[PDB]
Every structure is written in C-alpha cells, then in structure tokens.
Symmetry: D2
C-alpha cells in the first residue's frame, strides 16, 4: 500500500553491497530481481489493471529513495517508469489496456532503445522497412539504449529511411525484448552509472506486428509540434532525472555524515577537540543541507505541477506544457548543481582516510557526473532564461 | 475577500513614486496611510475579533507582494504583523480579547521597541521600575526600534533594574504609542530600508499600567527555555524577513526584465542584433530565475510548517519548534544569498545607462544589503549544520 | 621622485573627505587641483619631454593607491593616463614631442570624447565635416565622455558622415578643451563613480586644424585591422580599469578590517567574546584576501607583459597584441568579480550599525558596480574562451 | 640543460600510458626509472655537489610539467624534492656534503616516513630508543609514508617514548632504505594518486648511527617555535602541493580542449553547428582559464618569495617566515579550488561519450580530490584570515 516503505526496505537490503556493486560494474542481477519481486515495477500502472495507481509525487519519492541507496538503480528504475506512460501518450486504448495488464500481471521490466537526442532522423542507425501486412522490420544497432538488457518489454524507435511516402517517419513500437533478432549487448562501461545497462542493442530483421506499433507513423514528432499529450515525454523524463540526482546527493550527504560521526579526526593543530565540533565542518554540512533544501522543495512543486498537467489529459494547452517544462528545466539545473557540489564537497569533511576504495565514497560524484551529461544543463538554464525574459517556451522534443 | 489582490492594488499605486521615495528617505507617511486604509493591518487578527483571520502562508504572500513594490514597506508591514501575536503567545485571554479587538476595529499600526538581540539583559537601555499597583515605569532610550514612529500600539520590553526578586527580568508590554514620556525619534538613516522608521525611542518616566503587562516578569525568557509557544517569536520573524528579501529580489528581476526588453542595447562588437537574444544575458536571467525558484519553494514549505506548528497552540513540543527553526534558518540563508546575488547581478544585464539615478536600480540591493545584517546569516547556516551533523536544535532566543 | 609616495600622501589627505565627496557628486575640483600641483599628471610622459618617465607597472601602482582612497579619482586619473599615449600610438613624431612637452610643462589634465564603443560609426553623434585647408569641423553631442569637463587637452573622435571618399572615417584629434564651440556639460549622474565627470560634451562648429589631426583619416580603425601599435588602446585602458577595481576592493577591505577591529560586536548568542575571533568572520576575511591575491598577481603579470609589448614599439606582431589582450581580458574578469564580491561581502563582517551613511561603506560597491558595466565582462570571459579553445585572438576594437 | 624541456620530453610518453597506469594503480616502476635516467632527481642539489643547482621557481615549473602529464608522478617527484633540503634546514655541513653528494652521484630517489601531522607526538607509531653511542633504534609502522617504496635514501622521524630524558623528542634521520629492518609495504590504495606509494613502512629494530641523525633531539620542533630555518618545511611542502594541483588542472583542461575540438558534437536541438562555436562551451573554457590564471600567477609570486626567504639562510626573521606561509596558504586554497573546479567542470564541455573509461577523464578530479585532503583547506583559509584581520602569523608546524 505505501510504496515508499517498500522502496526503503530494498534500499536497506542493498546498502550492504553498494560498494561492491559500484566496484564490480555489470548487471545488478540480484537487485533487479528484488525490484521485480517487490511489485514496484507496476507503480504507475493504474490499479484497475493490477498496478499501484500511484500519483507522480509518490512515484518520484520512490525513485529518490532508491537513488539514495544506489544511483544506478534509481536511474534504471526511474527510466523504466517513463516507458509505459508512452503507451497511453501515443498508443491506442486497446494497447493501453493490454500492455498495462501484462506489465502489472507479469512484473515486467521495460527497456528502451528509442530516441537519438542529437542526430538527424535520417542518420539514426535503426531503420524500419514497411511490411506487406502493415508492420515493419527493424535492422541496425542503437548505440545508447537504456535498460534494454534485462528488460521484458522493449520500446524501440525505427526510422523509415527508404523511398516510400513515410520516408523519415519515426515508428514507435513496444516489443518483447526476447523476440528473435533483438540482441542487447553487455558492453556498457562508464566512470559511473555502472549498473544502468546503457550499452548497445542490435536489431537483425526484427518483426514488429501492426498491433505492436504505437500510434501513426511519426506520432511522437507530431505530438511535439502541437504540444499534445505525447509532448509530456521530456518533462516527465527530466524531472525523474533531476530526482535521481537529488537522491544521489542525499546518499552522499548521509554517507559523509555517518563517517564524520564515526571515523573522522579533529584537526588538532587548530585545537579542535572532536571532528563533529569543527566550526568549518559544521558550516559545510549547513551549506550542503541548505542547497538540498532549496533544490528538493523545487522538485516537489514541479511534481505537483506535473500531476495537475497529467490530470488534464488531452485538454492540456501548449502553455500548460511550456510552463511545466520551464519549471522542470529549473529543477534539473538546481539538482545537477547541488548534486555535483555535495558529492565532491563532502570529501572536505571526510578527510584523507576516506579516500580508501573500501568506502567507495567517489561513487556518488561519479554517478551524478556521468548522467548529468545526458543532456547539457547550459540549455536547461537558457530555456528558463528565454522564458523569464521573452516569455518563450522550449520547442518540444526528446530533451525539452 | 482576497488580501493579495488588495496588496497588488497597493503595489500598482506605489509604482510611480518608488524611485523618488527611496531618494528622499524619511517616513512613507502617505503609503502608511494607504495601508492602514486597506484593512491589511489586521490581516492576522482572527475574524472573531474583527480581523481577516488569514493564515501564515496567505499573510506571507501579502508581505512579498508589497516587498516587491517597496522593500521598506514590505519590511514595515511585515514586522508590524509579528507584533500582535505576542499577545496570544504570552499574553492572557482578556488581553487577547481586549487588544486584538482594538487593533482590528481602530485600524492600528503596531510597532516595537522590544529586544536588543546582541546585548546582555542587564545592559539593555530601557529599564523598568516596578510600581506597587503592580504596574511599571520605563526609563531609557531604545536605539533600534522598528516602526515605533507612526504606530498606535507599541510593544516594549524593559528590564527590571532595581534589586527586587524580579531583578534582571524582561517585562513585556503593549502601550499606546502616544503615551506621555515616549518619544519616537525621526533619526533613521541607512543606505537601504530608508523608510522602515527603524530609529531610536526614548522613554521618560513612562507609565505601563498593570493590565498592559503581557504575562509574568520574564515570560519570554522562560518560554524560550521550555520551547513553549513564546518561542515561536524567532521563526515567525525570520520567515517574514526571508520573504521580504525574496520580494525584493523579484522586484529587482522584474525591473531588470522590463529594462532589458525596452531599453538595453545589443553588444554590437560581438554581432548581437537583439539585446533579448544575447546568449549570456539569457543565461543570467535563467540563473536568477532558478535561484529564486529554489528559495521561494523552500520558503513556501516553511510557511506551511509554521502554520502546522502554530495550529497546535500550547501542545507544540520542543521538537516541533526545533525542526521549524532549522527549516526557517535555511530559508533565511537561501533568501539572503539569492536576493544579494540577484539585486547585484541584474546590473550586468541592465548595462551602463541603468546606473542613472532616475532608475534607482540600486535600491533593491541596498534594501537587502541593509536588512540582511540584522542577524548574521553565517549563524543561520551553522544552526542548520549543527542539526544535520549533530541532531541538535537551536537554543531558542530572539533570533533563533 | 617616487610617484607612489606622492600618491600615498594625496591618499592620506583625500581619505578625510571621502564620504563627504561621495555623497556630494559633481566635480572634485579641489582634488583635481591637488593632482595638478603634485606633478603626477605627466607620470607617463617621458623624462626627455619633462615628465616622470615611469614604466607601466609603476603608473598602475599609482592608479591603485589612488583608487583605494577614492574610486572616482582612481578612474579619473587612470583614464587621463590612457589619453596622451594615443599621440605616440597613432600620431606623428612632431606631435608627440610637441604635445608631450606641453602636457608636462603645463601639467595638463587630458579628457576624452572619443569612441562610441557600441555604435556603428555612421550613427556616432559627432560628425566631422572636412574643410579645404585639410582640417575638419565638428558637430554633435557625444553623450558619454570621460573627464572632458575640467580637462585642458581633449582627445576627440568624429565621423565623416557626408558623401565624400573618406566616408565612415574616424577622425582622431587632440584639441584644447577651451576651444570655441566645445561645451562639456555638468550632466554626469550615476549611482557610483559620481566624480568622474563622465557627462556629455557639445561640439558646435568646432574647428580641428590639420596639424591637430592624429594620423591619417580612419587611422585607429586601420590600426585595429592590422594589430598595429594603435591597437594597444584596449589592452591599456582595460588593464587600468581592472586596477581601479582592485584598488577599490582593497579600499573596501581596509575600511572593513578597521571597523571589525574597533567597532564590530561579537555575536553573543553564538557565545563569541571578541569580533576578531569569530570563526566565520576570520574565514570571510581569508576568502576576500585570497580572491585579491589571485587577481592582483594576475594584474601585475599582465602589466609586465604590457611593458614588454609597449617596448617593442612598431615591431609588435598581431600575436603579441592578441596574447596581451587575452591576459588583460582575464584580469578584467578576475578584478570585476573579486571587487564586486568583496565590496558587497564586507558588510557581512561589518554588521547592522555599519549601514549608517556616516560610514559611506557602500561607496566601494557602487563605484565598482557602476564602472564594471562600461563593457560586458561576459565578452571578456568569452574572448578568453575562444582563445583557449580555438586559438583565436579577440578582434581589435575600442574594448578588445 | 633546461630541466623543463627534459621534463617536457618525458610527459609526452607518460601521457600515453596515463589511462592504463591510473586504471592499473600499483607503483610506476618504469616511469620512476625514466626520471632516474633523465637526471632530474638532483634538480635541487647544488651544482657543487654534482646536482643541477636549480632555483625554486625552476624546480616548481618542472613539478607542474610532470603533474600535468601524471598527477601521481608530479606528486611523487615533487615530494622527493622536499626531502634533501631537510639536510640543510636542520642538518650539519658535513651531512650536506656527504648526502647531497650521494644523492646526486648515485641518482637516488629519496622518500620519507616522517611526520604524523595530526597526532600528538606520544601517539606517533615510529618510536626511537636512544642508544649509548648517541644513535637510535626505531620500531613501529608509520601508516602513511611518501615514496618510501623504491627509494634509496629514506628520511624518517621517530619519537622518543620511553623513560628517557629525551621523552617527547622527534628525531629526524636519513638512512639508506636498504638498511636491515626497513620494510616499505605495497599496500597503498585510494581513489586517486594511485601510483604515489603513500603506504605504510615498517621499522623493526632499525639502527640509526649517530651521524645519520639530522640535528639535535627535537631539532624541527625547536626550529618551529623560533621560526628558524627548519620552519621552512611547511611552506616548501605546501607550495609544492599547490603546484601539483595546478599542473593536474592544466592536464585536465588540455585533455578537454583536445576532445572538444576532435570528438564533441554540437547540440543540434539548440541549433548549434560546431561544438567549438557553442557560446556556453566557450564561456566555460574562459572561466577555467581565468581561474587558473589567478591561481598560477599567485603561485609564481610565492615561489619568488620562497627563493628570497630561502637565500637569507639563517638570517630569516620570524616575520619573513610568517609572511611567506600566509602567501603559500592562499596559493594552496586558490590551487585547491581551481583544480577541483576545472577537473569536475570540464566534463560539462566533453559530453556523455567522454565518460567512457578509455579516456580516464576522471583521473584528474580523483587525483586532486584525494591529495587535497592531506591537510584541511579551511585552515589555510583561516590562517590567511587571521593575518589579514589581526596580523597573526601561523603557528609553525608540519603543515603550516
């Protein structure tokens, strides 16, 4: 019933292995299995199809608890959350019902190999060839996927790239990851986010049934142009990312605080008696907490705003979407700066012995530092700027 | 029906004379008359005594709306709102019924010549001598008052300087400001907050009648010791200061934004055609927005927390009060830093021509630079650090 | 003899009047008379023509000493130093020997009504009509001059605006401020730099004799395209400004340190006994010192590079000029940011009583805050960027 | 013949193995031999004893050049340099001749196992039992050494701890690393500085002959109290650490710049065509450069000061020493803050593909983030503050 208490349960189980898992890399096989058994993969699926029917504020608190324990798992779980709502954003009422039921009844992980955020559609490596029955065949390798490996239902985008009428169209599809010719590779390596399985997936003559296709050809692109419901993709994904960073910064701050209390030593040349009494340590913790106090309050207001817009369904206006995306862009900036500042800053109050790999203290920083490059925070800042000054809204796309 | 519309009406009325009034300094006689006419002075008086019975977040949104038009007037009304609560915090039911009725029915301003926040009690200048009717006579000059000049009801503290059992006791009282022997000087000069009327008040043989004495000798100090309801003084007042700063910062950003859109020139040596399209200008506007976005959302949650605590009445616990002060201390820090950063930083986007006094663009920075020095923000920061690191709450006083 | 010692002695005298002069505005007639009688006006004229013959690093040290006492006088004197070198940068040998000699024999103040640093030339307010005798006739109001009012010798630019073959040409001339038709106005008004006399000058049929024309028509512009000696204009002026801001920052920091040692109170609720022992005050003074330490060391290294570049005369390469301008651009940024930060920041350690106008503690910030808008620091930062990343040098112009 | 050129020659090869050896950790055995064969090891040894006789500024420029290729090597080399000068600070004439000569003639690495910077002397792990011939016997395990492993000459401190009249005295000694009972262990581990060999050294009844003892019992401690020449220990060490951090910051900024220009893709959602033309990329690079500009200029100035004070021999006064340490302390804070800032910030301009471990882009941050904890920068800031405010010099000790 309360999914947060369920998430905190796993979080506590996982803290015993946090250092090892960041050290070893590869797939968080046992942890993915705990999330599976927990029920939480169906957190946003409406109750009537077996899910928890959670609102966005609650789902976001789940993501934060998980991200505090483990940035890779918060990311993996968070991004899994953004996949299914695509069904109801752009798909049919029949697909909604069927796919939501299956997700919730089977506790499926969903993965994606969808957008290429920074390439021209004619240059995306995953091509879709029209089929006689109205389906497509996919071929080509998507280089940056998210959770494809280990997923059950895979959300993939192909681009029609031959000379027919749908030339350049983006075909959105939800398909079984185990279908013949889908090959998720085990080739993800990064300084951080090491267990998010964000490697490549090969598609070899992969059939997509006409019924597996979500909306018309190019339905994502057309929803963006209009600011229709499918244009909520970016603010939803961006707000979850922001909250993964916040959850990581909390876990850095709690890790450092427990170390200051147990293992840090006072700077005896300055006459300090105990490490928890140093005036500058104290000021530091004060600054970390305050920066998070500001960033988390903004994240929470953005989540309520996302819920209000969500609840409008098809009646949302470009202006409702614009204003949400402006607020999220600010949260994302806030979260990115605070998380990078705290995860590097706590070292100053941990001290030289805390640089031993056994504590794995650089993992928070490496995780935030890795994902915060997913898209450039300088353009999140400029979107907010353009809105403040010119009342302009960002142009809807995969990242804004 | 809506106090914020009424404050917003006052805001537009004051706009044409914002510059000249900061230039001139002295009292804002006419703007104070405007406010007393609006009914706003009784905003927090409960309905059953004739007031609006608004709650904290609503009264705070009025303070910000005003602060934004005029930092001195935000602060003046702001601080006026914190005075009458003293009556229910430490006064008696009869005093409450008597004083609040009078305040709401006679559209009174309240002022104070109350605590000296950084001097030992036995050095406070206002000395109280007990008179055997159970009353008091006050002698001395309080150097820093707030709003005493121009007020109708004056909340005063004196210290017992004889050698009776009461010796050392702070004695709090509400008196009509025109009482014989009370002289509010017009001697307030400061770089900013020029119209806050924060000068000295002399007390010559001033009679405080027995029924004007709020609670027993030393009531506030004893309340601080226990975290009883008296000990809400500091977080109410500091939350209002923090929202005055934020209103100032929004007044600064609005002023800049209108100037950049109408008056600013493009930097032609860099190929810029529209000052509104300069990439750095846009960036600075985003960073100002984002800083306020965090500090405002934090301030909003703290007003809701203050309402929850206040609503508990006498059943509040030391933890309730302690967690509220730590939250408010962080909001005071966030608001300080955001307001100074924005009120100084807008000049960069305004440009050389906006340094002309006809714009009075430095009034926002001068108003925040002045009042932020009321109590040191480094100890707000440290209080939050001591709680984060050590679990410890601030020691209750006039500023924490 | 020692120019810095003469400067310290004037600084002593002037510091007594510093608050009074900042609240006065208008011209610092008496202070400009002190400078004239000092002989310092010819500090950079070579000995052989009667001047002090000082190198760039010594002239700069004098500027800093003066700016620390008084930001307006610092800029007024420092901008004066920039003017005469235009004679040797673009004029003939006869004019150099003649004009240097007069400046030095007569102790002339030099003023400028020169460039419009953000207008296309055909829009410059000051038009040059050519006359048959080889001269020009000037008409227009140049809106922002520097020290035209109270100068003896005026460096003026005008644009040929007619249909002729020299159309668009910037004419450079050195003329007597006292020439008929030259009207410097007393219209300078600003939040800071109030005694820099940076108002407008009217030209009404002002005659420029062929022999007072500094070089060929449009020689400055040709100098910039070629990275010629004339293109040392911006580095020199930009390095002097940086030094003005540092000197003002030192003044703010010295004023604060005096106040902290004599007047500041300890914060007794923090249990502090002495203001000079508060840990966060000591940290703050440390941060201010450290920011200046870095910006000062960078300023000094750039003044030796300027000496080295200056001492090649016409043998300088575009590369020598580019590199210098890059370094100085970085100094302008360091100084701007250190000066704004220190001049605002010192209030934190001064405290509420120091907001009283009798201290004039905000003059430092207002001074730096006003002048730092002459040209946008963001494009200084971007120029350093483009060099760092791409190896491009700034395009030589009036401010780069 | 030019040591920076020689070190230039070596960096080009180390830069190419940088990634692997960081991912590898362990000792840099081939690299350490590269430096031996270079001859740089006797850089600071007087020309007259067969060394280079370089000055401090030159020696420092070599440390930066190495540090920019490899932070671990820079640290190792730079620390090595601090050792032999111990002989002239507190050792005799005879010791200088003999040991400088052996260091230079035999191209020895020197290592240390000297101070415990944050333990009372009676807690140090390395104890010294006085022997009847005026020698000592060392027992204990020093937990954190620098470059003891693979050294030829080893500088060791021991405390007298028994009954002896010498109780409390720190004994400094240089002994051959091959001496029986000396066991430098291979147990160094940390997130950064991975090849610095800063592990434990065991001493088992290690005999120190009377003429291997550098000065009197407790020489350093006595030299500190007096601010005699021995008290140059801290500023030499600290200034060396500051420049290792700056060389690392330069390597990070060089590695970023190469990637931005050859690998980085423009953000096409914002219309950017070339990664090198992004306005915000260009701004970040200007900012990194400008912060290093200030820091590097302040460090070069402190190296000249250190030369001056060094050259006074025993004529240095307590104030010369106090002044040098305040300067060095500001450089340490400037170098620490710049290097943290730039090594994390660059990732912003590299983008997501740059997080792949084949670039090892995080090694720069890991290196600085690790050694920056050696002693707390907040007390570097505070010493500087106590000097600025009160004129106090730091208490001389192993780190200040």
């Amino acid at each position: 019933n309360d999914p947060v208490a369920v998430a905190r349960g796993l979080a506590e189980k996982w803290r015993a292995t946090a250092v090892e898992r960041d050290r070893a890399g590869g797939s968080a096989t046992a942890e993915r299995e705990d999330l599976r058994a927990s029920g939480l993969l169906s957190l946003l699926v409406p109750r009537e199809y077996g899910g928890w029917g959670a609102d966005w504020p609650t789902a976001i608190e789940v993501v934060r608890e998980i991200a505090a324990a483990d940035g890779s798992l918060g990311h993996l779980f968070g991004y899994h959350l953004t996949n299914a709502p695509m069904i109801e954003l752009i798909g049919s009422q029949e697909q909604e019902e069927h796919l939501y039921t299956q997700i919730a009844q089977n506790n499926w992980w969903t993965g994606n190999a969808s957008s290429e955020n920074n390439s021209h559609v004619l240059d995306w490596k995953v091509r879709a060839t029209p089929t006689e029955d109205g389906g497509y065949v996919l071929n080509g390798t998507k280089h940056f996927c998210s959770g494809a490996k280990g997923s059950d239902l895979l959300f993939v985008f192909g681009v029609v790239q031959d000379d027919s009428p749908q030339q350049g169209a983006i075909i959105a599809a939800a398909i079984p990851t185990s279908r013949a010719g889908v090959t998720p590779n085990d080739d993800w390596a990064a300084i951080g986010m090491r267990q998010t399985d964000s490697g490549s997936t090969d598609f070899h003559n992969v059939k997509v049934e006409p019924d597996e296709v979500l909306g018309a050809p190019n339905a994502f692109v057309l929803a963006f142009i209009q600011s229709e419901r499918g244009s909520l993709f970016a603010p939803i994904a961006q707000l979850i990312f922001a909250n993964v960073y916040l959850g990581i910064a909390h876990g850095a701050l709690d890790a450092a605080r427990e170390y200051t209390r147990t293992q840090a030593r006072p700077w005896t040349p300055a006459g300090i008696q105990q490490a928890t009494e140093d005036p500058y340590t104290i000021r530091s913790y004060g600054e970390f907490t305050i920066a998070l106090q500001g960033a988390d309050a903004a994240a929470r207001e953005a989540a309520h705003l996302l819920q209000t817009v969500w609840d409008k369904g098809d009646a949302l206006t470009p202006e409702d979407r614009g204003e949400l995306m402006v607020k999220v862009s600010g949260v994302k900036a806030l979260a990115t700066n605070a998380a990078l500042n705290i995860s590097s800053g706590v070292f100053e109050v941990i001290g030289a012995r805390g640089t031993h790999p056994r504590y794995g203290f650089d993992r928070f920083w490496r995780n935030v530092r890795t994902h915060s490059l997913h898209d450039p925070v300088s353009y999140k800042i400029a979107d907010v700027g353009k809105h403040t000054l010119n009342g302009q809204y960002p142009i809807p796309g995969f990242t804004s």
